[PDB]
Design a protein around this ligand. Structure first.
Ligand SMILES: CCCCCCCCCCC(=O)OC[C@H](COP(=O)(O)OC[C@H](O)COP(=O)(O)OC[C@@H](COC(=O)CC)OC(=O)CCC)OC(=O)CCCCCCCC
Ligand SMILES: CCCCCCCCCCC(=O)OC[C@H](COP(=O)(O)OC[C@H](O)COP(=O)(O)OC[C@@H](COC(=O)CC)OC(=O)CCC)OC(=O)CCCCCCCC
Ligand SMILES: CCCCCCCCCCCCCCCCCC(=O)OC[C@H](COP(=O)(O)OCCN)OC(=O)CCCCCCCCCCCCC
Ligand SMILES: CCCCCCCCCCCCCCCCCC(=O)OC[C@H](COP(=O)(O)OCCN)OC(=O)CCCCCCCCCCCCC
Ligand code: HEM
Ligand code: HEM
Ligand code: HEM
Ligand code: HEM
Ligand SMILES: COc1c(O)c(C)c(C/C=C(/C)CC/C=C(\C)CC/C=C(\C)CC/C=C(\C)CC/C=C(\C)CCC=C(C)C)c(O)c1OC
Ligand SMILES: COc1c(O)c(C)c(C/C=C(\C)CC/C=C(\C)CC/C=C(/C)CC/C=C(/C)CC/C=C(\C)CCC=C(C)C)c(O)c1OC
Ligand SMILES: CCCCCCCCCCCCCCC(=O)OCCCOP(=O)(O)OC[C@@H](O)COP(=O)(O)OCCCOC(C)=O
Ligand SMILES: CCCCCCCCCCCCCCCCCC(=O)O[C@H](COC(=O)CCCCCC)COP(=O)(O)OCCN
Ligand SMILES: CCCCCCCCCCCCCCCCCC(=O)O[C@H](COC(=O)CCCCCC)COP(=O)(O)OCCN
Ligand SMILES: Cc1cc(C)c2nc(SCc3c(C)cccc3-n3nnn(C)c3=O)sc2c1
Ligand SMILES: Cc1cc(C)c2nc(SCc3c(C)cccc3-n3nnn(C)c3=O)sc2c1
Lengths: 93, 51, 385, 62, 54, 126, 385, 126
């Protein structure tokens, strides 16, 4: 077959990273350790720790785009009212 | 030494240009091929002196 | 070698969903691309069975949808799946594309992966328009009138493009008979663009939430990411069950249960909810030539994002100014969708004018200024000079 | 230190490692999740082929 | 012992008995929910008002 | 794709300026801790994307005692992410060992690339 | 390397139609497989434009084909191309499969190439049936009656398969509305089987008229077999022009210009000319269960040919007894087609009975006896013992 | 796929029989000339398909002076086909040089394959 251009990934055996030396790795069977391990103390303090970092990056952009729409919904509710009679005649035309 | 190119090799400034005035005379001329049968702005084609 | 890597066709299955080297670090946001292969199978399969009981003439169109719903055996199961499933098709695709610009995968070497994905998003908007015009309700007539009238603003070309798009002089009977035949075909062009989309992924693989390379710690697809796949596929079909059987008409307009009339006009003409932010951009420009240019050059502004990111780190994980401007772009796409279902009034014309400028200042003014400030702030915070 | 000194796994380990303890409860659950996916998948293929039968206004003209 | 080699080892069972148990599952469980639906709603069916008009 | 030649050109001008480096350097320090890459056991030069022909040059020229210790910091960070925890405070990089080990090899692979193109687009005259 | 072998998608184009190594010896019979990629493009393109003006109801079906032919601009060009082009689709495919069993390519290592080709021939017969039932002429009603009545002979299953195939109790209005929706889909399944068909060719290449290996003398595709391709593509569209403009109704039945009536029966019900040899095999067996088994196990008798050739030489070039029995099988497929357009009379029931036995004695009795006699006659003609 | 072993078993029985080899051998000679493979400059053992693991074995064991002269007879035949002519009568293989050069290497690659399967399906008893 014709070989195409080289890329930044290989396969099993020649993945294309750097050479390693001196790292050991241990493991146990899944059949040998407990069932139903990760249920509690994850969604008690651990999962509570995760979104505690990334909630001041969402709710501050949310508190501006919800102040802005709720403020302009009490204004297309006052211009089409009876007390908003002289203030609609000047704005639309 | 420190002269004109960005991502293009700019030494082809008009070493790309006057022949694509004639590929522009071959692709806008390509739009002088498919505009037929579509008599909408082909008043811009059918005023030639023969036929 | 085994038989699964010796056969012609099984080695295509083995290289993609069995022994494909995946990173060890990816989370549940890399599952939205798998649901979209199931979402496209559902919408094609339920539509071929509904095409056996449908008549595309303009005097029979709002009676073959009702013949399906009361006479066909389990015909209400077929339709409600093909009307809430397409709104489920879009909620996943909005979350697929939003992940890929957070982790920032559009970068090198995956730019062809990002460019064939923008073509899929254009062809997906076009099918949902062409099929919603096949019910021929009251929203289905005045939605095709407003959109096809925009192509008359092209100078010296306009009224010979609309009369070719209509087959007549308004939204007639040849307009509905050509919109069904194009509704059958473009779902088969999307499926050939998904096959080309998977090819550009096989040569570089997926990214990771860290951004850095992942060729040092990899895991095969079988027994780990197939059993991580089925967690979200059983959650998908469970919320696709709580709509088709309990609230089958919440995502829809009641005016589509009136047959379409070219003589009485509705009090409001508003789109389906996933075309609403693109509707407020068209209505914000007070010209029908500069309004149709702006709305088409808002799906095609994604192609300038590979050339506008000036940072050296990939993805917005460790970037705290490029994370505050990702969540301004999110709630601006929600405020744009809200305004496209309002009336043309004060202040919903100046609010839809500012917020369609923030759609364009992100990709062109906000990205390259903030992705350059960070490159200096990662430098002078370390280098002792 | 040496590579012949494995780290401690007793924080995650069972206290009585009989082999059939986890070989039964991991085939009852994969057995149960191949029983509902066999009855919940014949009923879906049958709903799509019941629609091609005789329509309700065709059975009235019988 | 005497639980895993009953019907968990054999795949001719593990393809068959996961399928054969679905046949009795689509009759007992189907009857069990088409008797809770009626008993929850009785007095509002057609059979309850056809016997009230005698 | 901003260039470290250009990053270092701007960055040296702030560090030489005595009035600019009382405005930008505390903002540069809170931006580092709020990035949080040290808690995963990584220096900053680990984070740089390596999919261009200049970063592939600067990694071959790196000494092998540093090339082995960097392949372990990456693998230790892929496992801290998967378990959704963080490393203990005895395995965090402190504020003294976060130094650029790759910036000398980068800045000379770029200056040799800004001479091969200047010598191929050239207008010498007699 | 160049850009055409570096790109993701262009290297797929380069490996197939630019730099694919071809043998130096192939003749003009290796061009019929290229016409079938053009034949399938024509039939899909002309059919999407004709699907914009068509109504599939049983009371509108024989008036939307005439509205195309009298009112649509150049609508007679579209229909006559889509009715003489499908009869051109089949004359090439009968010559494609006949080459591949002369040069005998079905052999090792190309058996998957022969098995995915039999699946294409089954799906091609099914589209031409389903689309000829969409005109709803008089031949289009009594052709669907005779074929769908065969599925009642299945014991304990029969009358619950026909009533599911009909949607009623005879060939009703739901029968015509489901046959059009299946006519749009199966041409898109054929195109995905042609992509799998080309993959099994790329790993072994083509054969040659000599039979022997051809890895010693090869020529690329560009500038030689592309300019040898265009000789036959300009001949194809020239005889596709002498029919659509000069004799557009020779390959057809005049009874299809009468609207279909379930009360008056025609004096003769005969198929289109390319289903005629398979029609005489069904009518030759005097039982409607053993007749529908025999006609389906006559397209599926091609799969036993890789296991029945006992020769050591590939192809019938130097085989003079295996060449006399290739041209008996050819003129037997012509006599079978002639009898399927006759009356059920004497002697056209005993002639169609003998000649449907020679269709089966070829693949099972004539091939392995003659391909074994030749192996001994190539041996004792040389070996001095 | 009709095994040479079996071809040679039947073929030797006709050649040993003195009454059968006055019936089959003239039919075997007209079948060779009407095949016409000699006019293209080929012996019969060139014609055999080589896409099985026995003919791939019998071609490696062939001597190199014969392996080079066979690669030229194939190439000379691909060019005679393309020009649609025939070779001159000075380049036709005569009736004496058409001998099996590949049948000794074939018959022993088969007999070694009919011992590896007989020794792997075996019912020895004590
Ligand atoms: C109509 C569309 C329906 C389509 C089906 C639902 C689509 C889901 C899309 C949401 C998503 O993909 O985000 C995933 C994210 C998980 O973050 P992570 O992967 O870092 O932690 C994995 C965990 O630790 C291990 O999770 P584990 O495997 O241990 O347990 C199972 C898990 C439920 O599995 C799921 O599928 C969750 C989506 O248990 C739960 O986590 C409880 C949740 C019900 O979850 C979040 O962070 C929550 C963000 C809110 C999402 C907002 C979406 C706006 C539309
Ligand atoms: C529905 C049909 C749509 C059109 C498709 C046409 C199908 C064609 C299939 C027939 C075929 O391919 O057989 C090829 C056969 C000769 O086999 P060969 O390749 O060894 O000879 C190459 C030649 O020496 C060089 O031919 P050369 O390249 O020199 O010139 C080309 C020639 C015609 O080109 C063709 O396309 C022929 C098909 O130009 C001329 O003759 C000038 C005329 C003014 O050519 C023949 O003449 C044999 C005809 C008998 C076939 C009848 C079968 C029909 C059922
Ligand atoms: C034309 C193109 C337009 C398309 C743009 C469409 C944008 C709107 C689409 C719907 C909004 C959904 C997008 C939100 C998901 C984007 C993906 C993403 O943000 O990445 C997940 C990231 C996870 O953060 P983690 O730290 O936990 O993971 C480790 C990596 N740092 O981030 C997280 O922290 C998880 C997200 C937190 C939930 C908040 C989601 C937004 C809530 C509003 C939903 C919108 C519907 C009202
Ligand atoms: C599932 C069921 C399968 C059914 C498939 C059977 C369909 C039969 C339809 C007949 C059309 C096929 C015609 C034969 C095409 C394949 C033959 C072939 O590939 O070439 C054989 C032969 C080549 O001879 P050479 O060119 O090599 O001679 C050079 C001398 N060295 O070429 C020749 O010698 C030319 C001989 C031409 C014979 C013409 C017969 C065609 C008759 C068609 C009648 C049409 C009626 C509608
Ligand atoms: C990507 C694939 C598809 C999408 C997103 C899609 C979307 C839609 C939508 C949104 C509607 C309007 C539903 C309503 O509000 O009633 C619709 C209608 C319809 N579509 Fe689909 N569709 C897809 C594929 C198909 C295909 C392939 C077919 C044909 C086989 C089809 C056949 C129909 C039909 C017949 C209707 C008629 C109206 C109805 O029955 O509700 N669809 N489509
Ligand atoms: C029918 C529509 C689509 C399908 C079936 C699809 C399929 C997939 C799949 C299976 C993956 C790999 C798994 C994953 O990364 O989650 C993927 C990744 C990706 N998709 Fe899509 N996709 C679709 C639409 C899109 C669109 C609309 C875009 C962009 C505008 C897009 C851009 C990407 C990118 C950039 C990636 C790579 C992400 C990464 O590897 O980090 N895709 N797609
Ligand atoms: C392999 C591809 C195809 C084949 C062999 C085929 C064949 C045929 C044939 C033989 C007829 C009968 C023509 C007549 O006698 O009037 C027909 C009718 C028809 N076919 Fe096709 N067809 C193909 C693809 C398609 C496709 C994709 C469409 C999609 C819309 C289509 C649409 C039609 C229509 C609308 C008719 C109506 C009758 C007429 O207009 O003549 N065909 N088809
Ligand atoms: C739409 C239908 C088809 C298409 C587009 C197609 C296409 C092709 C092409 C392009 C080739 C390359 C060699 C050549 O050009 O002759 C080929 C070869 C072949 N085809 Fe088809 N074909 C089709 C139908 C069939 C059918 C119906 C069969 C058999 C029942 C078949 C069996 C074969 C075989 C055996 C070969 C290999 C011949 C050789 O290499 O000597 N094909 N096909
Ligand atoms: C990064 O690593 C990954 C990875 O993480 C994942 C999740 C996946 C898996 C994700 C997917 C989305 C799967 C791939 C998607 C497809 C194959 C979808 C394309 C196929 C279709 C759209 C098929 C369409 C369906 C039909 C044509 C059926 C037609 C209907 C019929 C015939 C019924 C009518 C019949 C009758 C009798 C009425 C990978 O493949 C992968 O490797 C790249
Ligand atoms: C032996 O050597 C060869 C070889 O000889 C050849 C010819 C090829 C070339 C390959 C082929 C000829 C295969 C042919 C491929 C097909 C037939 C696939 C085409 C399938 C389709 C479905 C195409 C039709 C697609 C459409 C979208 C229809 C168009 C409809 C439109 C544009 C709608 C019109 C309406 C509007 C509003 C524009 C080889 O690859 C090859 O190497 C193996
Ligand atoms: C659990 C998950 C769900 C299950 C999913 C199953 C497994 C998922 C894996 C997905 C597999 C995707 C792999 C993509 C693929 O199929 O590759 C393409 C096949 C290769 O063949 P090809 O070259 O396309 O065909 C051959 C083609 O390349 C022929 O091209 P040609 O005609 O030569 O050029 C075009 C015409 C140009 O002509 C001109 C204009 O000159
Ligand atoms: C298998 C069925 C699927 C359907 C057919 C599969 C593909 C068959 C071929 C189809 C024609 C494809 C030719 C396109 C060539 C375009 C060149 C190119 O891709 O350049 C790409 C960029 O293209 C894009 O941005 C997306 C284009 C979408 C294409 C949609 C048709 C860049 O090429 P590249 O990055 O490899 O160059 C680096 C050189 N050092
Ligand atoms: C479809 C879009 C194209 C995109 C890429 C294609 C993706 C491949 C789809 C996966 C197909 C999986 C096939 C695995 C089994 C193949 C076994 C095999 O090699 O069969 C070959 C040939 O048979 C076939 O052609 C079957 C092709 C399968 C196509 C389904 C219609 C061996 O045949 P067999 O083992 O039955 O022995 C001969 C006895 N008749
Ligand atoms: C690029 C592109 C293409 C198309 C085709 C397109 N179309 C729309 S809005 C159509 C509409 C209106 C204006 C009013 C009521 C209902 C619908 N309508 N029509 N279909 N659907 C799903 C709807 O909601 S933006 C857009 C953008
Ligand atoms: C496997 C298979 C499938 C099918 C579906 C099939 N069908 C026929 S024969 C149909 C027919 C008759 C009996 C009489 C008049 C006209 C038509 N007729 N219907 N369509 N076309 C093109 C026709 O000629 S054999 C056959 C074999």
């Amino acid at each position: 077959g014709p070989p195409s251009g080289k890329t930044y990934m290989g396969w099993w055996g020649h993945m294309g990273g750097p050479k390693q030396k001196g790292i050991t790795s241990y493991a146990v069977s899944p059949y040998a350790q407990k069932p139903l391990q990760g249920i509690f103390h994850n969604a008690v303090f651990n999962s509570f720790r995760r979104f505690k970092s990334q909630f001041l990056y969402v709710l501050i952009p949310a508190g501006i785009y919800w102040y802005w729409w709720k403020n302009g919904n009490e204004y297309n509710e006052f211009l089409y009212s009876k007390a908003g009679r002289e203030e609609l005649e000047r704005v639309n035309v | 030494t420190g002269l004109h190119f960005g991502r293009l090799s700019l030494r082809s400034l008009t070493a790309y240009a006057p022949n694509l005035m004639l590929w522009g005379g071959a692709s806008m001329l390509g739009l002088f091929v498919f505009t037929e049968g579509w008599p909408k702005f082909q008043d811009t084609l059918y005023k030639k002196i023969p036929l | 070698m085994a038989f699964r890597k010796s056969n012609v066709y099984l080695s295509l299955v083995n290289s993609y969903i069995i022994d494909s080297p995946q990173p060890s670090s990816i989370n549940y946001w890399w599952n939205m691309g798998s649901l979209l292969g199931l979402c496209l199978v559902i919408q094609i399969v339920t539509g071929i069975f509904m095409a056996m009981h449908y008549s595309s003439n303009i005097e029979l169109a709002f009676s073959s949808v009702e013949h399906i719903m009361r006479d066909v055996h389990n015909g209400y199961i077929l339709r409600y799946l093909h009307a809430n499933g397409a709104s489920f098709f879009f909620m996943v695709m909005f979350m697929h594309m939003a992940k890929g610009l957070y982790y920032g995968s559009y970068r090198s070497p995956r730019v062809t992966l990002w460019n064939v994905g923008v073509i899929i998003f254009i062809l997906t908007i076009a099918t949902a328009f062409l099929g919603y015009c096949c019910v021929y309700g009251q929203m289905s007539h005045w939605g095709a009138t407003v959109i096809t009238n925009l192509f008359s603003a092209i100078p010296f070309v306009g009224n010979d493009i609309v009369s070719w798009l209509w087959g007549g002089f308004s939204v007639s009977n040849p307009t509905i008979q050509r919109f069904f035949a194009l509704h059958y075909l473009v779902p088969f062009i999307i499926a050939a663009m998904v096959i080309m989309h998977l090819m550009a992924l096989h040569i570089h693989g997926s990214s990771n939430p860290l951004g850095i390379t992942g060729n040092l710690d990899r895991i095969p697809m079988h027994s780990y990411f197939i059993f991580k796949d089925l967690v979200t596929v059983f959650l998908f079909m469970l919320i696709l069950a709580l709509f088709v059987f309990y609230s089958p008409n919440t995502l829809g307009h009641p005016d589509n249960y009136i047959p379409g009339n070219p003589l009485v006009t509705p009090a409001s003409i508003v789109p389906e909810w996933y075309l609403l932010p693109f509707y407020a951009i068209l209505r914000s420009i007070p010209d029908k030539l500069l309004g149709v240019i702006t709305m088409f050059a808002a799906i095609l502004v994604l192609l300038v994002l590979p050339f506008t990111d000036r940072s050296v780190v990939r993805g917005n994980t460790f970037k705290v100014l490029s994370k505050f401007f990702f969540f301004i772009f999110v709630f601006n796409f929600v405020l744009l969708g809200q305004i496209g279902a309002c009336h043309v009034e004060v202040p919903y014309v100046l609010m839809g004018q500012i917020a369609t400028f923030i759609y364009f200042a992100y990709f062109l003014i906000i990205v390259p200024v903030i992705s350059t400030i960070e490159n200096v702030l990662f430098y002078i915070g370390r280098v002792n000079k | 230190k040496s590579t012949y000194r494995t780290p401690n796994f007793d924080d995650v380990l069972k206290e009585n490692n009989d082999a059939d303890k986890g070989r039964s409860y991991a085939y009852f659950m994969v057995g149960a999740m191949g029983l509902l996916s066999s009855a919940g998948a014949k009923s879906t293929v049958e709903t799509f082929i019941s629609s091609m039968t005789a329509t309700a206004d065709v059975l009235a003209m019988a | 012992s005497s639980l895993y080699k009953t019907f968990f080892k054999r795949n001719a069972v593990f393809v068959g008995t996961i399928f054969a148990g679905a046949f009795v599952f689509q009759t007992v469980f189907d009857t069990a929910i088409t008797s809770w639906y009626e008993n929850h709603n009785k007095g509002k069916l057609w059979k309850d008002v056809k016997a009230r008009i005698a | 794709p901003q260039s470290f030649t250009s990053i270092a050109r701007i960055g040296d001008y702030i560090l030489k300026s005595p009035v600019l480096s009382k405005l930008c350097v505390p903002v540069a320090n809170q931006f580092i801790n709020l990035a949080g890459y040290k808690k995963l056991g990584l220096k900053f030069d680990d984070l740089i994307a390596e999919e261009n022909p200049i970063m592939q040059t600067a990694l071959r020229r790196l000494p092998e005692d540093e090339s082995y210790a960097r392949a372990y910091r990456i693998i230790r960070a892929h496992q801290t992410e998967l378990t959704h925890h963080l490393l203990p405070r005895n395995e965090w990089i402190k504020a003294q060992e976060d130094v650029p080990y790759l910036l000398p090899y980068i800045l000379e692979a770029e200056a040799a690339a800004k001479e091969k193109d200047e010598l191929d687009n050239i207008e010498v005259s007699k």
